[PDB]
Amino acid sequence: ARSEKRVPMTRLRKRVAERLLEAKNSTAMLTTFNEVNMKPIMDLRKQYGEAFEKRHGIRLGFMSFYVKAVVEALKRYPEVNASIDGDDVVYHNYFDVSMAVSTPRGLVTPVLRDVDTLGMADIEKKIKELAVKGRDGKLTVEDLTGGNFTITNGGVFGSLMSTPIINPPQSAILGMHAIKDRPMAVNGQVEILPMMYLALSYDHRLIDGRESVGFLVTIKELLEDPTRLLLDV
Amino acid sequence: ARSEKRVPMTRLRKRVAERLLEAKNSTAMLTTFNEVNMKPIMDLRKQYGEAFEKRHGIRLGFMSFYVKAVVEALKRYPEVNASIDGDDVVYHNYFDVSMAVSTPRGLVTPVLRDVDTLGMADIEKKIKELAVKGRDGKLTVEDLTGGNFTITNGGVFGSLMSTPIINPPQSAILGMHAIKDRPMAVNGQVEILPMMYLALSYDHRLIDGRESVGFLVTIKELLEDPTRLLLDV
């Protein structure tokens, strides 16, 4: 023991903290995990990265693949793309995806609207536009309100695996993690692959085991072979 | 935005959702993990599978090994085979084990009664009889009521690892997962084994760290060498 410096909570971190609590206490939040081999997507960026930027005037990142994979998973599992509004269950026939962006002063989740209708290049541009506004802090309340599902990337900080927190009134959240070289079994041979752990936190009131697991398996399948988005399999 | 189809929840899904919430909020649910090498059990099924079905008229699955291992663990750790009834702690001197079966309409959990008194062949017969009733939907209220402990298998859906949800008034739940070929250290050499992650979610009000961890270690020990059930070690 020694001394104590009390610092009061600002209007924001007071209501952010009240809302994370009311989220945790109002939902039956559970987390299902999976792993994904990133070499396929890393190879696409290594091969077509130059040609992609020349054609579209924006660099090909990972986030466009994650969004494209989440939208297809939201189509196959419409129970995950829903809210609970008191006594009603609201199924959304559109794909608005909340996406956590870093600002030095707090962390915000702006919304990408009608992502089902955007190309890979268009997605990466809308993320840069929202990410510039976040870093500068010029983000509208139009930009922050709504969203059916959140993607968070704690991998920028080197986290192996974690339990992400649901952003109500949303039902689920997908947590991206660090890409780490790990020995894997490949056709009965021990081969090193760049592996990432995926976490899906989901509300067990609305989403049962089969849907939560199957949703996250869908995302794993479409990240390990982006070509499956075209075939739809 | 586009359109949304809201459909109100009946007395059922309204109060099932309120009861999953009051369960989650009224217990101190935590999850401890472990891994198990399935090659020993996979080898027993490959070797004695034909001879077992001929003799008993029922196929040798994994679930008989899991039940046999859970019952022995419930005997060694009686704190896990208990409920909390308000101000009382109810220790059960019998082994009724809830067991999740896959049904087209969600997932249902019939109860196996006095499993301590059943042979491997008897267990596999009672599970097939309850699994047929689940798939057909001919499951009695006698069949669903009660149970001291739940075994859930999200591995049927290809989940790597997850936090299963306790089914009150029960204290704990064991989550089985996908069996995945993974490189393992065996006598200082890298050998590929079929590995499964085990998850035990437990009520920290009744079950402390030592009991929860030790219970799940017991199940790992008895699945990696089923011959330990006979020796009792």
Added chain:
Amino acid sequence: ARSEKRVPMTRLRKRVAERLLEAKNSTAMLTTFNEVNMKPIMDLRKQYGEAFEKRHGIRLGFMSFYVKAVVEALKRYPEVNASIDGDDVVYHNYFDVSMAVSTPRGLVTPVLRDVDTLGMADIEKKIKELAVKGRDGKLTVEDLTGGNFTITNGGVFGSLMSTPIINPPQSAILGMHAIKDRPMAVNGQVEILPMMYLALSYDHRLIDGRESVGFLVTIKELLEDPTRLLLDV
């Protein structure tokens, strides 16, 4: 089913159970994971173990390394070394570290005071002195009250990974686990190392993703090369 043996809870375990609930329901508890190579620390114990005990009259364990690493991480991330008092955030300018000790009568968490001021030998002596008092049950109310952060070691019981529970009014808890030989990627070659999973459960009201992840990465960095504690890098 057969019979059931009902045992009442005294105010003993009645108010512990009520307080685990008010802890869980008053905090937004999340858990971030990481892994650490213990070979460096295991090699130091194998090399200097004899010479250390001769010089200080106390055996060199792992817990001195974990405490030394936690204190340095608490300095780099002061938001983790804090409590929430209603509308205030209380920053502590001292390092009192709660440390879970296993006793036949439940589990107790005595406090190590001003650990920032203790050498490796002093730490190991204070842990043995508090561990003897726990096993004997001669532990003071001075010894149990307070603490800014908890370290728990469920690895003594062979747990692979788990979600530790926050010890209010503290913000976070670090969970140590079993050391298991696992194949690891080292300069693109598969080498077997003695690996342990780390779990940090944290209150998301006060601790955001960047701090929680970065705190646990700091502990991993200082356990994989204890010589970084001296250099402070």
Added chain:
Amino acid sequence: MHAIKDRPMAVNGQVEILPMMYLALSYDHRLIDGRESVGFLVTIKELLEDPTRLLLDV
């Protein structure tokens, strides 16, 4: 302290090259005897060959 020079050294019965420096301690033999002077300089050698010994204090 002196120059660091690559020199062949005996290491677990194998000749391996290490970057070696000679240490000199000049001491007043009125106040410091052989055992203390030698033991002082051995301590410095031990703590420079493994700086992690400063943390453990061994």
